[PDB]
Design a protein around this ligand. Structure first.
Ligand SMILES: [Mg+2]
Ligand SMILES: [Zn+2]
Ligand SMILES: [Zn+2]
Lengths: 71, 1335, 49, 91, 98
DNA sequence: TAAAGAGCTCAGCACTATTACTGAGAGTATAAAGATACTGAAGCAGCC
DNA sequence: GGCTGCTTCAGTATTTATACTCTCAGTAATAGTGCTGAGCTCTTTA
C-alpha cells in the first residue's frame, strides 16, 4: 500500500533526499545481499526501501553509521 | 570527468597537428570493387580500416598481428570505430579569406583594419586593387586603386610601391599589423574626441583590439591556407538507413572544391596568363565559400531540382541543426504510442495498458526473469519462448509490473503536468484507458488523441517518478494553488442533478434519522431524491487540538444532499453541502479539504466523488431533444417592432434628414437593444417555468431544462450558446471588422437562410485561421521565455535583508480587482505588520504568510504590506527561499534547489494558446481625499484643483481604500477634501473639451506682445461676438516675430507683474497656437474660467513586445532632475527647452518634436521623474529615472491585467522572476577603486561581489547603474555561448566567442544537458553541491 | 515524350486518385487550388487569400 | 542542366584551350576561332561523361543494399534507380 | 507501435524514427523542460543518453538489465562528439579543458 | 603363401607471367548560340 | 564637425540529352605453375 511519500517527507522534510536514500537502499537490497528490515509481502525492492524509510528507522544518519560499523 | 569547455582559433600548424594525412585525389570508389581509392576522399590510407583489424593485405588476422601497419595496404591495423572520427586536411595552393569573420555583420575584420567592407570585398574577387605600403608616393597602406589607376601609377611607379588584389594582401596586412602601439593610439584619440559617434566606433575597435592582443590569437589566421576535412564516416556516401536514401552532399562541394585546387596548381604549372589565374583564384575562393556557409554570396549554389544544398553551417542551425534536432530532442528506445480511451473503473494512481506494448516494453526484464527462473537456459531459448507467447510468459510479466511505473505524455507539452507517471493495469485490448479526471491536465479530448509512453529503468529512476511525477503527487496547478483535479463536466451534471430540490416530490418533508435510511428510501422507490426533508445527522471537526470531536443535529435538506454527505470525509461541517452544488462549489470544497486534511483524504474523496457522480448521472437520464429549446413567443414581436422603426429611420435618412454615419450608429444601437431584450425574454421565460401545486396553488422555482440544467450547473456550455440557440445571434463581423447593417434575425431552432449562413461561414473561417497563427506565435513566445530563465535555481534560504515591495490591492480607479489577501497569500514578509491603530504589530517579523494569517489580517482592514521579492534578493547565483515563499503547488515554504525559472516560463507561456488578438460620479459612501494637490477657490467658493497630478481617493468607513482616480487640471469639486459622499452624484467634474490654463488670482490681463498678424490674430467671434484678439501659432505666424511670442504678464490694477502668491516671480507664460483668452484687454477676471482655452495593441503581441523591452512609440518625457523650465534656441529642426535644478547645474537641454503638448509651465519647479510631457512609459527610462520597483510593479500590472481580461490566473512571482532575469548587466559609470573601464558593462552580481570585496576596504569600488535589456538581448549576453548557440543566431555568437577565446565553466542547465550529466536541478543539485565540495 | 511523361508522373499538380469512396473519388476532381507553379506557398500564405 | 557542373565544365575547357594553343598552324586552318571552339567542346564532353558515370557509380553502389532492419520493403523506387543505373551503363 | 530496441541512425546513433521503421517516440525540448520542472534528474539523463546514444553505455545497460542489475553507467553523448568534430571542421579549434 | 620393400604417378596448395583492359593523354581548326512580415542595425545621406 | 532620417540587408516564425583516335600503361585477374604426399605399383623372397 505504498502510493504516497507524504510521511516519507514528514521524516525527511526534503522530498529530494528521499530519492537518494531510497536509491542507496534499493541498490543494497536488490543486487547486494541486504535483507528487508520490514515484513515483505511481494513488494518490489524500491517499495521495500520506501517502507523502511517511512517508519523513522532508516535515514542518512542510521544507514551511514551502519556502513561505518561495517567498514 | 572533465571541467570547462574552451574555444579558440587554430593556426594551420594545429590543423596539420590534427590530420592523420592529407587528401589530394578527388575521387573515391572503384565502382567494381566498390572500395576506396588509393589516395582519395574516403581512402583508408589516411582514414583507416573499412573492416576491423584487417585490410587489403589480408595479412593480419588476430590480436597477434593487429596494430602494426601494412605495407601493401600501408594502413594501420585496428577496429573501424576510429575511422569514424579521424580528421584530415588539404594543403591550399592559394590563401583564402574566411567568410564568417568577413560577414559577421559587422565584419570583425573590416573594422580590424577599419575598412569599409566593400573595399575588402572588391579586393577578394579582384574587381580592384589595394595599396600595401605605397611608399614614396601619395598612396596609402589602406588606399585601394581602380584598376586603371593602378596601371597608370605603376607605370610611373613600377618601383617598390606595392598594389595587389586578393587574400594575398590581406594576409599581408594582418600579418603586418602590430597592436600595442595601435592600442595606445586609440587610447589617445578616444580620450581626445568630442564626437560621440566617433567615440563609439573607437571604443568598439579598441575593445576588439584588446580582445585579440589580450590572449594568444593571431589575426591573419582568418586567412585560410590549410583546409581541415571532416572524418569520412560522418558524411557517408549514402546513409541508406532505411526509407528513401539521402545524398550527404558535403563530399560534392569537397569534390568540386578539391577539383579547383588542383586545377589552380596545374594552371600555375603552365605559366598561365595571369588574368585567368585570377579567375581560377576566384573560383577557388567561391568554392571554399560555398563549402563553409552557402548563400552568403549572390547566387547560392542550388543543389538540384531547384534546391539549395547544405554547407557545414546548415547542419548546425534552424529547427533541424544538431542543436534543435538531435542534441536536445531525440527519439528514444523503450517507448510506445497509441490512441486513448477512458476506463472509469480505475482509481487515481494507475493507467490501463494493452498487453502487446506491455510485452515489448519489458522484453529485457522478461528475459532476465525467465533465465533466473531456469524456465529457459539461453537467450535464444528466451527469444523463442517470447515469440509465440508460451502461456507462462504472462504471469512472468505480471510479476515484473507489480509496481513498475510508467511515464505518459501528450504531444504539445505545455507545462509541468503534460507528462506524468502511473502504474499500469494490463488490458487484453489495444488502446489506453485513463482515469477520467486527469484528462484536463492533458487538455485532451477523447476524439482520436494519441498518447506516448516511456519507461524508467534504474531503481533511482522508478523512485524519481514515484515520489515526484505520480498523479497522487500533482494536484495543485503550479500556475496557481488551484486544485487542478477539477471534476470536469459529467460528474458535474450528476452532482448538480443530485443536490437540488423539487417543489413537491414523493414523501417530501418527512422526517428521518440517518442517511442510510436516505439511501434505502431512495432505492426502494419510497422516497424521491430532490425533495425537502428533515433528517438527523452529525458531523466532526478537529478544530480542537487535532481531535475531530463529533456532534449531532437535525437539518432540513434534500435527500441526495445526505446521500452524498455519507461520503464527505471527517473534518467538514455540513453547511459546505446544503447548497445546490454547481461546479465551483465542488472545487472550493476540494481545496479546503486539502488544506485542512492533508493529502490522502483528499484523493480518496475525489475518487469517490467521480464514482458517485457518474453513477447518479447515469441514473438520471439527462437526455435532450427538440423540446429542450423553449422559444420566446414575443421574439417576432420585438423583431417586428425593431424592423418597423428601422424602416422609418432609413426612409428618414433617404429623405435627406440625417447623416449616414450616425444613421448607421443608430441602426447598430437599435439592433443591440432588440438583441438584449429578446435575450432577457428567452432566458427568463426558460429559467423559471416551474409551476406546480404544493398541496396548495403552485410555486415557481428553478426549472429543469436539461439545457438549463447544464447552464446553471455550469458543467458545459455558455449562456451565450443558449442565446444563439433560442435568441437570434445578433450581428456578425466583417472581413474588415465592420458589421453588417441588418443582423442575423434567426435562431438555430428555425433554419438560417442562405445569406446569414454565408456570413457565419466567413466569421468561422476567420476564427480558425487565427487559431492556427495563435498557436504558431505562442510557440516561439514560450520558446524565448523558457530560454531566458533556463538557469534560476533556489540556491539558499534567506538572503539576509528586510526590504522588498509594499504590495496593495489593485484599483482600476473604479472597482478593485485583487483583494490584498492574494498578493500576500504565500509570500514571505520581510517586515512585520501593524494594525491601523498605531504600535499594534500584528504578524511577527519575517514570517511565512499562510491562510489563517490572511484571515487575521483581512478582518482588520489591512492596507498594504511590504514583503520579500525576487528582484530584491541579496544573493548571487539563484535566490534565497524566503524571497520566493511557497511552491504554489505544495503548501509549504519551497524547498532548496528547484528550477523556478522553467516552471514560471511554462506557466506564463501556456495560456497564450487561447488568448485573444470625462466625468466622475462616485457611487460609494465614505470620505474624499486627494494627493498631489494644488487647488483654487472661485466666486463659487468651491474647490477646483490646478494640477494634472491631483489624485482623488475615496476611503471607505473601514480603513482600506476603495477608490482612487486621477482627475485632470481644472476640475470643479462640489465638495472639498474630508467630507461625506454617496452614490449617484459627481463630487467633481471638468471639461475635457478644452485646456484649462487658469491663473489663480484676480487682477489685470493684457494683450502684451499679442499684436495681430505677427503672433496672434483678430477674432470677430462669429459664434458670440467678442473681439478676442486670439493667438495663432507663432511658428506659423510671421517668420521674424515668431520668437517674441505672446507672454501673459499677470498683473494687478497696479499693472505691475503680480509676483505669484508667496513667490517673487509672476506667471509669465505663453498662449501658443490656438490658446485663447477670449476675455479682452485690461479685464479684471475672478478665478473660475481658464485664461487660455484649447478644445481638445493589447492582445498577446502586447505581452510579446513588452517582454522584448520594445519601443513605446511616443514616450513621455519625465524629469531627469528638479528645477524650472526655460526656452532658448528654437527650430534647429525642432522645439527646444532647458531645465535647471534648485541647487545644481542645469543639465537638461533637450529638443522636442514641436507637436508635443507640455505638461507643466516654465516657472514651476518639478521633481525628478515627473512626466514633463505626455505619452507612454519608456521602460529603460522608467528604470533609470524611477529605480527598480517602479518598473517592476508596472510590468506586473500590465501583464496581469491583460490576463485578467481573460479570466486566467497566474501568481505574480513568475513575472517577478522573469523581470529578475531581465536586468542582469549593469553599466559602470565610474571605475572607482576597481579596475574596469567607465563606459562599459559587467554582470551585475559579479561586480556586486567585486564591491563586497572592495568595499570591505575603504577603497570604494566602481559606481554603476543597473540596466534593462529585453529577453532577446539578455539571451545572448550570457556567461555561456553553448546555451547561446542553442538559442537563435548561432553564427555571430559563435564566431564571436571564438575570436574572443572564451571558456565555459558549465554553470547552468542547458549546458549540463549536452555533456549529459546530473543537472543541478533536483537530485543533481545535491550531487553538484557534492562534486564542487570535493575540489 | 520525356517532358510529357515527367509532367504526368511528376508534378505537384498530380497525385494518386484519392480512392476509397465514390464520394472522395469525386471530391478529388472538383477541387481547385492555388499551389505550385503560379501559386503562393504553404507558408507564404497571406491572410487575405 | 546545372550551374554547378557548368562551372567545372568551363574550367576544363579553359585549361584545354590554354594548353592546346601551343600548336596552331596559320598557313593551314586560317582561323583560330573554331579551333578553340571544338577544343573546349571536347573538353566539356569529357568532363560531363566523367561526372555522369560517377553518379552512376553512386546509384550502382546503392542498389546493392536491401537488408536494412526488418520487413516491409519498397518496390516502386528501387526499379528506377535500377533502370537509370542500367541506362547509363548502356553507354 | 512499440520499440524495445532496434536499429540506429549511423551518422548519429540515435534510434531511428517513424513507424515503418521500428522507430522510437519523439522526445522533445518541451518535455525536457517539463522534466526539469521536477527534480527529475536521473530520469532525464538515462533518458537522453543511456536509452538513446551512449553505445558502450546502452550495451552495458542492456546486459545488466537482462541479468538482473538496475544500474547506470553515465558515459558521454556521441552525437555531441559529432558536433564537436563538425565545428572542428571549420578552423574554430574547440577543446575540452582539463 | 603373403608381409613387406621401393617407385609411378595422380589430389591438392602456390607462382609467375600473362592478357584483356580499363584508365590518362593527346591531338581536336562551321558556328558567335519574380504575390511573408517584423524588428533591428550600421551605413549612407543631407544640415547648422 | 558634429548631427538625424532613409536604407538595405539580415535575422525570426528523384535526379543531367551528341566525339575520335589512338596510344599507351601499368594493373589486376588469370592461367602456368611444382610440391607433397600418397596412394596406388610393384615385385621380393621368406
Ligand atoms: Mg484532440
Ligand atoms: Zn595490403
Ligand atoms: Zn533573498
Amino acid at each position: 500500500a505504498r502510493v504516497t511519500v507524504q510521511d516519507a517527507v514528514e521524516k525527511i522534510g526534503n522530498r529530494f533526499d528521499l530519492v537518494l536514500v531510497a536509491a542507496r537502499r534499493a541498490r543494497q537490497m536488490q543486487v547486494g545481499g541486504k535483507d528487508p528490515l520490514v515484513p515483505e509481502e511481494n513488494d518490489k525492492t524500491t517499495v521495500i526501501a520506501l517502507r523502511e524509510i517511512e517508519e523513522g528507522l532508516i535515514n542518512n544518519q542510521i544507514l551511514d553509521v551502519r556502513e561505518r560499523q561495517e567498514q | 570527468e572533465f571541467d570547462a569547455i574552451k574555444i579558440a582559433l587554430a593556426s594551420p600548424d594545429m590543423i596539420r597537428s590534427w590530420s592523420f594525412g592529407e587528401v589530394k585525389k578527388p575521387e573515391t570508389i572503384n565502382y567494381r570493387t566498390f572500395k576506396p581509392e588509393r589516395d582519395g576522399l574516403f581512402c583508408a590510407r589516411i582514414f583507416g580500416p573499412v573492416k576491423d583489424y584487417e585490410c587489403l593485405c589480408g595479412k593480419y588476422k588476430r590480436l597477434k598481428h593487429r596494430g602494426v601497419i601494412c605495407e601493401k595496404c600501408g594502413v594501420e591495423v585496428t577496429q573501424t570505430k576510429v575511422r569514424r572520427e579521424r580528421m584530415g586536411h588539404i594543403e591550399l595552393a592559394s590563401p583564402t579569406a574566411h567568410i564568417w569573420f568577413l560577414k559577421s555583420l559587422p565584419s570583425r575584420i573590416g573594422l580590424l583594419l577599419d575598412m569599409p567592407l566593400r573595399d575588402i570585398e572588391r579586393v577578394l574577387y579582384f574587381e580592384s586593387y589595394v595599396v600595401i605600403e605605397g611608399g614614396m608616393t601619395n598612396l596609402e597602406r589602406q588606399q585601394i586603386l581602380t584598376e586603371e589607376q593602378y596601371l597608370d601609377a605603376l607605370e610611373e611607379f613600377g618601383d617598390e610601391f606595392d598594389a595587389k588584389m586578393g587574400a594575398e594582401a590581406i594576409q599581408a596586412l594582418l600579418k603586418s599589423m602590430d597592436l600595442e602601439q595601435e592600442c595606445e593610439q586609440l587610447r589617445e584619440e578616444l580620450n581626445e574626441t568630442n564626437s560621440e559617434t566617433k567615440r563609439k566606433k573607437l571604443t568598439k575597435r579598441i575593445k576588439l583590439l584588446e580582445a585579440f592582443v589580450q590572449s594568444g590569437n593571431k589575426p591573419e589566421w582568418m586567412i585560410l591556407t590549410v583546409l581541415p576535412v571532416l572524418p569520412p564516416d560522418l558524411r557517408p556516401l549514402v546513409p541508406l538507413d532505411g526509407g528513401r536514401f539521402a545524398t550527404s552532399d558535403l563530399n560534392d562541394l569537397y569534390r568540386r572544391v578539391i577539383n579547383r585546387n588542383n586545377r589552380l596548381k596545374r594552371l600555375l604549372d603552365l605559366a598561365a596568363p595571369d588574368i585567368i589565374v585570377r579567375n581560377e583564384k576566384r573560383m577557388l575562393q567561391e568554392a571554399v565559400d560555398a563549402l563553409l556557409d552557402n548563400g552568403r554570396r549572390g547566387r547560392a549554389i542550388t543543389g538540384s531540382n531547384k534546391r539549395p544544398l547544405k554547407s557545414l553551417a546548415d547542419m548546425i542551425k534552424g529547427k533541424q541543426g544538431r542543436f534543435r534536432q538531435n542534441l536536445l530532442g531525440k527519439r528514444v528506445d523503450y517507448s510506445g504510442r497509441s490512441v486513448i480511451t477512458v476506463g472509469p473503473y480505475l482509481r487515481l494512481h494507475q493507467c490501463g495498458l494493452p498487453k502487446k506494448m506491455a510485452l515489448e516494453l519489458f522484453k529485457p526484464f522478461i528475459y532476465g526473469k525467465l533465465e533466473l527462473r531456469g524456465l529457459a537456459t539461453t537467450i535464444k531459448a528466451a527469444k523463442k519462448m517470447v515469440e509465440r507467447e508460451e502461456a507462462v510468459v504472462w504471469d512472468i510479466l505480471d510479476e515484473v509490473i507489480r509496481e513498475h511505473p510508467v511515464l505518459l505524455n501528450r504531444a504539445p507539452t505545455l507545462h509541468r503536468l503534460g507528462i506524468q507517471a502511473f502504474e499500469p493495469v494490463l488490458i487484453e485490448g489495444k488502446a489506453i484507458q485513463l482515469h477520467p479526471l486527469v484528462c484536463a491536465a492533458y487538455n485532451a479530448d477523447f476524439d482520436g488523441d494519441q498518447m506516448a509512453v516511456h519507461v524508467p529503468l534504474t531503481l533511482e529512476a522508478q523512485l524519481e517518478a514515484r515520489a515526484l511525477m505520480m498523479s497522487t503527487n500533482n494536484i495543485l496547478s503550479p500556475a496557481n494553488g488551484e486544485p487542478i483535479i477539477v471534476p470536469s463536466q459529467d460528474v458535474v451534471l450528476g452532482l448538480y442533478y443530485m443536490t437540488r430540490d423539487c417543489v413537491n416530490a414523493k414523501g417530501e418533508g418527512m422526517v428521518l434519522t440517518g442517511p442510510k435510511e436516505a439511501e434505502r428510501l431512495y432505492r426502494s422507490g419510497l422516497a424521491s431524491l430532490h425533495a425537502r426533508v428533515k433528517v438527523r445527522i452529525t458531523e466532526y471537526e478537529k478544530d480542537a487540538n487535532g481531535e475531530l470531536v463529533a456532534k449531532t443535529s437535525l437539518k432540513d435538506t434534500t435527500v441526495g444532499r445526505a446521500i452524498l454527505w455519507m461520503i464527505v470525509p471527517k473534518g467538514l461541517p455540513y453547511s459546505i453541502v446544503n447548497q445546490a452544488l454547481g461546479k465551483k462549489a465542488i472545487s472550493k470544497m476540494l481545496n479546503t479539504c486539502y488544506r485542512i486534511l492533508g493529502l490522502k483524504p483528499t484523493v480518496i474523496f475525489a475518487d469517490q466523488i467521480m464514482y458517485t457522480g457518474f453513477a447518479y448521472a447515469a441514473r438520471s437520464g439527462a437526455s435532450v431533444g427538440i423540446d429542450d429549446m423553449v422559444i420566446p413567443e414575443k421574439k417576432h414581436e420585438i423583431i417586428s417592432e425593431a424592423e418597423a422603426e428601422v424602416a422609418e429611420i432609413q426612409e428618414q435618412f433617404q429623405s435627406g434628414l440625417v447623416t449616414a454615419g450616425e444613421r448607421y450608429n443608430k441602426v447598430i444601437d437599435i439592433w443591440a437593444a432588440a438583441n438584449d431584450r429578446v435575450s432577457k425574454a428567452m432566458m427568463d421565460n426558460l429559467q423559471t417555468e416551474t409551476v406546480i401545486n404544493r398541496d396548495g396553488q403552485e410555486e415557481k422555482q428553478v426549472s429543469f431544462n436539461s439545457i438549463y440544467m447544464m447552464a446553471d450547473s455550469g458543467a458545459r456550455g455558455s449562456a451565450a450558446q443558449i442565446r444563439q440557440l433560442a435568441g437570434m445571434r445578433g450581428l456578425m463581423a466583417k472581413p474588415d471588422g465592420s458589421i453588417i447593417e441588418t443582423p442575423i434575425t434567426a435562431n438555430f431552432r428555425e433554419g438560417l437562410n442562405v445569406l446569414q449562413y454565408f456570413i457565419s461561414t466567413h466569421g468561422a473561417r476567420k476564427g480558425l485561421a487565427d487559431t492556427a497563427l495563435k498557436t504558431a506565435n505562442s510557440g516561439y513566445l514560450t520558446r524565448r521565455l523558457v530560454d531566458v530563465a533556463q538557469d534560476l535555481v533556489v540556491t539558499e534560504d534567506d538572503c539576509g535583508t528586510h526590504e522588498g515591495i509594499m504590495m496593495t490591492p489593485v484599483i482600476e480607479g473604479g472597482d478593485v480587482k485583487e483583494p490584498l489577501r492574494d498578493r500576500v497569500l504565500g509570500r514571505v514578509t520581510a517586515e512585520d505588520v501593524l494594525k491601523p491603530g498605531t504600535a499594534d504589530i500584528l504578524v511577527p517579523r519575517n514570517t511565512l504568510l499562510h491562510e489563517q494569517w490572511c484571515d487575521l489580517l483581512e478582518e482588520n482592514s489591512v492596507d498594504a504590506v511590504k514583503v520579500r521579492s525576487v528582484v530584491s534578493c541579496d544573493t548571487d547565483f539563484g535566490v534565497c527561499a524566503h524571497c520566493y515563499g511557497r511552491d504554489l503547488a505544495r503548501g509549504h515554504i519551497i524547498n532548496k534547489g528547484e528550477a523556478i525559472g522553467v516552471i514560471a516560463a511554462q506557466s506564463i507561456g501556456e495560456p497564450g494558446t487561447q488568448l485573444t488578438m470625462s466625468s466622475i460620479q462616485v457611487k460609494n459612501k465614505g470620505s474624499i481625499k486627494l494627493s498631489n494637490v494644488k487647488s483654487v477657490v472661485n466666486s463659487s467658493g468651491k474647490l477646483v484643483i490646478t494640477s494634472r497630478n491631483t489624485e482623488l481617493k475615496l476611503i471607505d468607513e473601514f480603513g482600506r481604500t476603495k477608490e482612487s482616480y486621477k482627475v485632470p487640471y481644472g476640475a470643479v469639486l462640489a465638495k472639498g477634501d474630508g467630507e461625506q459622499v454617496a452614490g449617484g452624484e459627481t463630487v467633481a467634474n471638468w471639461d475635457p473639451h478644452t485646456m484649462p490654463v487658469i491663473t489663480e488670482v484676480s487682477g489685470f490681463v493684457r494683450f502684451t506682445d499679442m499684436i495681430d498678424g505677427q503672433t496672434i490674430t483678430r477674432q470677430t467671434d462669429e459664434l458670440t461676438g467678442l473681439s478676442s484678439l486670439v493667438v495663432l501659432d507663432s511658428a506659423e505666424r510671421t517668420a521674424g516675430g515668431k520668437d517674441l511670442r505672446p507672454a501673459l504678464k499677470i498683473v494687478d490694477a497696479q499693472g505691475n507683474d503680480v509676483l505669484i502668491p508667496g513667490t517673487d516671480m509672476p506667471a509669465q507664460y505663453f498662449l501658443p497656437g490656438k490658446a485663447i483668452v477670449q476675455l479682452e484687454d485690461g479685464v479684471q477676471i475672478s478665478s473660475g474660467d481658464t485664461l487660455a482655452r484649447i478644445p481638445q495593441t493589447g492582445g498577446l503581441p502586447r505581452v510579446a513586445d513588452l517582454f522584448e523591452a520594445r519601443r513605446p512609440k511616443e514616450p513621455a518625457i519625465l524629469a531627469e532632475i528638479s528645477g524650472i523650465v526655460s526656452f532658448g534656441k528654437e527650430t534647429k529642426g525642432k522645439r527646444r527647452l532647458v531645465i535647471t535644478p534648485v541647487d545644481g547645474s542645469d543639465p537638461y537641454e533637450e529638443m522636442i518634436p514641436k507637436w508635443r503638448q507640455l505638461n507643466v509651465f516654465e516657472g514651476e519647479r518639478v521633481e525628478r521623474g515627473d512626466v514633463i510631457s505626455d505619452g507612454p512609459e519608456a521602460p529603460h527610462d522608467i528604470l533609470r529615472l524611477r529605480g527598480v520597483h517602479a518598473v517592476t510593479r508596472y510590468i506586473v500590472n500590465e501583464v496581469q491585467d491583460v490576463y485578467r481580461l481573460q479570466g486566467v490566473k497566474i501568481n505574480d512571482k513568475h513575472i517577478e522572476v522573469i523581470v529578475r532575469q531581465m536586468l542582469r548587466k549593469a553599466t559602470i559609470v565610474n571605475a572607482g577603486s576597481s579596475d574596469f573601464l567607465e563606459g562599459e558593462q559587467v554582470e551585475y552580481s559579479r561586480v556586486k561581489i567585486a564591491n563586497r570585496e572592495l568595499e570591505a576596504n575603504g577603497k570604494v569600488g566602481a559606481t554603476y547603474s543597473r540596466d534593462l535589456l529585453g529577453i532577446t538581448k539578455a539571451s545572448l549576453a550570457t556567461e555561456s555561448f553553448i546555451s547561446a548557440a542553442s538559442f537563435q543566431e548561432t553564427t555571430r555568437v559563435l564566431t564571436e566567442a571564438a575570436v574572443a577565446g572564451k571558456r565555459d565553466e558549465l554553470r547552468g542547465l542547458k549546458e549540463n544537458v549536452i555533456v549529459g550529466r546530473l543537472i543541478p536541478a533536483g537530485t543533481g543539485y545535491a550531487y553538484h553541491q557534492d562534486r564542487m565540495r570535493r575540489r | 515524350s520525356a517532358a510529357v511523361k515527367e509532367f504526368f508522373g511528376s508534378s505537384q499538380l498530380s497525385q494518386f486518385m484519392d480512392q476509397n469512396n465514390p464520394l472522395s473519388e469525386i471530391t478529388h476532381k472538383r477541387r481547385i487550388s492555388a499551389l505550385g507553379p503560379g501559386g503562393l506557398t504553404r507558408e507564404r500564405a497571406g491572410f487575405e487569400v | 542542366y546545372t550551374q554547378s557542373w557548368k562551372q567545372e565544365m568551363i574550367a576544363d575547357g579553359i585549361e584545354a584551350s590554354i594548353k592546346g594553343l601551343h600548336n596552331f598552324d596559320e598557313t593551314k586552318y586560317k582561323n583560330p576561332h573554331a579551333y578553340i571552339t571544338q577544343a573546349c567542346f571536347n573538353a566539356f564532353v569529357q568532363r560531363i561523361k566523367k561526372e555522369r558515370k560517377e553518379v552512376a557509380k553512386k546509384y550502382s553502389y546503392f542498389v546493392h543494399n536491401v537488408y536494412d532492419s526488418r520487413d516491409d520493403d519498397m518496390v516502386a523506387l528501387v526499379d528506377e534507380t535500377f533502370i537509370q543505373d542500367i541506362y547509363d551503363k548502356m553507354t | 507501435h512499440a520499440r524495445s530496441t532496434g536499429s540506429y541512425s549511423l551518422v548519429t546513433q540515435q534510434p531511428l524514427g517513424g513507424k515503418a521503421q521500428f522507430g522510437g517516440q519523439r522526445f522533445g525540448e518541451m518535455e525536457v523542460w517539463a522534466l526539469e520542472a521536477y527534480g527529475a534528474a536521473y530520469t532525464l539523463q538515462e533518458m537522453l543518453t543511456v536509452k538513446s546514444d551512449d553505445v558502450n553505455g546502452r550495451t552495458k545497460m542492456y546486459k545488466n538489465i537482462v541479468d538482473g542489475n538496475h544500474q547506470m553507467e553515465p558515459g558521454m553523448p556521441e552525437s555531441f562528439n559529432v558536433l564537436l568534430k563538425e565545428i572542428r571542421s571549420l578552423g574554430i579549434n574547440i577543446e575540452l579543458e582539463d
